[PDB]
């Protein structure tokens, strides 16, 4: 089951992701991402990501449907 | 949905810029003939499929008619 | 090509690469050409 869960987490990042700008991190497990579509969103950060890479304004790929940063 | 044919390329295919301000490549022109078409022509493409359904006669905006 | 007094420095640097190299660009991806920066006395003015 753990292996299947890992595969699911990896499948969350599945290519067709909308690029967005990381605006500011509200707190771990969440952050504000400004989607390139032209609307600011509040999304849920993925745990596996590296917190160091989350610069004040960096390009973050967002899930196309759920809009969670992945 | 009214649209314009920015360019026509040989595979027979058209590049359409919808009145919604989006450009869409068409794998096939549609229900009209590629020969009787050229850049800039008013072509009525479908709302979602974005396939050309019928050529539209040269339309003049109300302002254009008023300028006369 | 002709770039008469425009797109190469534009007073300051206004024009360069995309207005200095794009020149040499086609000026190479093709047969011999002449930049012809005519009327340099009116660049950016």
């Amino acid at each position: 089951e753990f292996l299947h869960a890992q595969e699911e987490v990896k499948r969350i990042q599945s290519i067709p992701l909308v690029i967005g700008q990381f605006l500011e991190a509200v707190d771990q497990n969440t952050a504000i991402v400004g989607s390139t579509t032209g609307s600011n969103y509040y999304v849920r950060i993925l745990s596996t990501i590296d917190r160091e890479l989350l610069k004040p304004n960096a390009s973050v790929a967002l899930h196309k449907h759920s809009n969670a940063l992945v | 949905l009214v649209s314009n044919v920015i360019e026509l390329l040989d595979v027979k295919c058209a590049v359409i810029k919808t009145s919604t301000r989006q450009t869409y490549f068409l794998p096939v022109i549609g229900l009209v003939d590629a020969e009787k078409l050229k850049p800039g022509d008013l072509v009525g493409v479908n709302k979602d499929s974005y396939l050309i359904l019928e050529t539209l006669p040269t339309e003049y905006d109300s302002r254009v008619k008023a300028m006369e | 090509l002709k770039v008469v007094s425009s797109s190469i420095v534009d007073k300051y640097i206004g024009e360069s690469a995309r207005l200095i190299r794009e020149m040499f660009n086609y000026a190479r991806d093709h047969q011999p050409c002449i930049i012809f920066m005519d009327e340099i006395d009116a660049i950016g003015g």
């Binding site: 292996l3 299947h4 890992q6 595969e7 | - | -």
Partner: protein, 286 residues
Amino acid sequence: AVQKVVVHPLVLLSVVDHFNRIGKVGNQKRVVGVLLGSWQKKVLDVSNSFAVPFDEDDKDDSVWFLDHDYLENMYGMFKKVNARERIVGWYHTGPKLHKNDIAINELMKRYCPNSVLVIIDVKPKDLGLPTEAYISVEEVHDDGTPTSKTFEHVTSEIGAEEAEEVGVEHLLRDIKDTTVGTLSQRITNQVHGLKGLNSKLLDIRSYLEKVATGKLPINHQIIYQLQDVFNLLPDVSLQEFVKAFYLKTNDQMVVVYLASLIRSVVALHNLINNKIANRDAEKKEG
């Protein structure tokens, strides 16, 4: 020619459904249907397949009725539904080819010149794919032998598209092995490959026995393909290869030893931490 045939999952479930429904009411050996698919450069991609009424007499082997109008009407309906699919061949669930398959193949060729017969077995076999795409070849045989219609073979593989893949993943989410090379699955796969090699070698040996006893003809072709196989044997125990392979085994074993040392140290650290935690809890108890 056809370099390869990709049979999408729906074709298989359609051919399992047709066999089940025909078998449930009445009893009929084999099940014949028309395969619909699109042509890549040389890789035929079968996506959909529809049943066609088919009565045959096993005794005569030359009596068989296949609807022409029914086939054409079904194809017209499917073209209305989705026109990207053109007829590309036929399938029959019969595990083995049949003497009348050539006539059916000609009838299919009447609708598609490049017809591929995919024999979709409906009996789960753990060793091998469930498809075998066949084509009709008329040649002069070169090697002074009588020529006949026969059935040339084309490689078959089962692919899928996004929608079919999603459906398959949902369907087999309770009997699916975890994706990732867990050592258990790797060792099991290696065992499976050994079993497959044994089965293939047994089949080859049975055919060789039949040829030697005369029950089947000496091909004079493909046989020398087996000879080439026997020439391509690795020829292990050569001194240079032995030294190189020992070097590689030791190079891998040193890394395995380092990994074992790391694992042992981590386990010992965890044991120390747990022991100290237990001792601290006991001391704080009183």
